[PDB]
């Protein structure tokens, strides 16, 4: 996260962290034995990492979880970013409480214009290289479908939504990927990619939840 601030230690709780020996890539928790993250973010050995603040100190909250299954969406095409997400199962049930909790998936898409909470481990400079230990919070608005798609031309489908500052300066970043965006209490987006960070007229491009959750209930409902 690029211009964003300190969350603050478990104050986004449904915020994971995945590892494989280290911090890759974000994703939600969506109920207790199942997160949400981008496909790009695919690999085996996956751990969750739940109730983190600082990825690098046990604090006491944390509960560490490895994945069971991974579940990359059948058209996810990763020359395009389309249909950049993916489900994780966890090997057992996390405990929920306030610290550790699911976010409830839309019924409905997000229009232009809503603010947005985005967060994650990832990069805090847009020319340069400085990953945080503890989470970074951004509250972004999603952009209009025709800035979105002047931005990034002949790039930006139905699957994707803009979200963030033309101006530049406020962005996610490499090393969020696979993480939130939550619009009223609902998961509507999933750190995708973009052009850099914090460049501007080069927003967050971000996948958009809302076209998913028929797939991903059914997905959960049968795995
Ligand atoms: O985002 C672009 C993608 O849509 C495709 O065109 O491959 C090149 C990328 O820059
Ligand atoms: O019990 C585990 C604990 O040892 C570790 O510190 O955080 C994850 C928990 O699952
Ligand atoms: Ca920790």
Same mark, same amino acid.
């Given at each position: 996260i690029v211009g964003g601030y300190t969350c603050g230690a478990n104050t986004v709780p449904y915020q994971v962290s995945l590892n494989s020996g280290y911090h890759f890539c974000g994703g939600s928790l969506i109920n207790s034995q199942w997160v949400v993250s981008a496909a790009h973010c695919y690999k085996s050995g996956i751990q969750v990492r739940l109730g983190?603040?600082?990825?690098? %100190?046990?604090?006491?909250n944390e509960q560490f979880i490895s994945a069971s299954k991974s579940i990359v969406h059948?058209?996810?095409?990763?020359? #395009?970013?389309?249909?950049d997400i993916m489900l994780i199962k966890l090997k057992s049930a996390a405990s929920l409480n306030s610290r550790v909790a699911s976010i409830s998936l839309p019924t409905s898409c997000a229009s232009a214009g809503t603010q947005c909470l985005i967060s994650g481990w990832?990069? #805090?400079?847009s020319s340069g290289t400085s990953y945080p230990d503890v989470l970074k919070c951004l509250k972004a608005p999603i952009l209009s479908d025709s800035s979105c798609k002047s931005a990034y031309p002949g790039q930006i489908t139905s699957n994707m939504f803009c979200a963030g500052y033309?101006?530049?300066?406020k962005d996610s970043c490499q090393?969020?990927?696979?993480?939130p965006v939550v619009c009223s209490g609902k998961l509507?987006?999933? %750190?995708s990619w973009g052009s850099?960070?914090?460049?501007?007229?080069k927003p967050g491009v971000y996948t958009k939840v809302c076209n998913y959750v028929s797939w991903i209930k059914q997905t959960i409902a049968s795995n």
């Open positions: 983190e603040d600082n990825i690098n %100190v046990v604090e006491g059948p058209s996810y095409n990763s020359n #395009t970013l389309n249909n990832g990069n #805090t400079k033309l101006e530049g300066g090393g969020d990927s696979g993480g509507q987006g999933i %750190v850099g960070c914090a460049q501007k007229n």
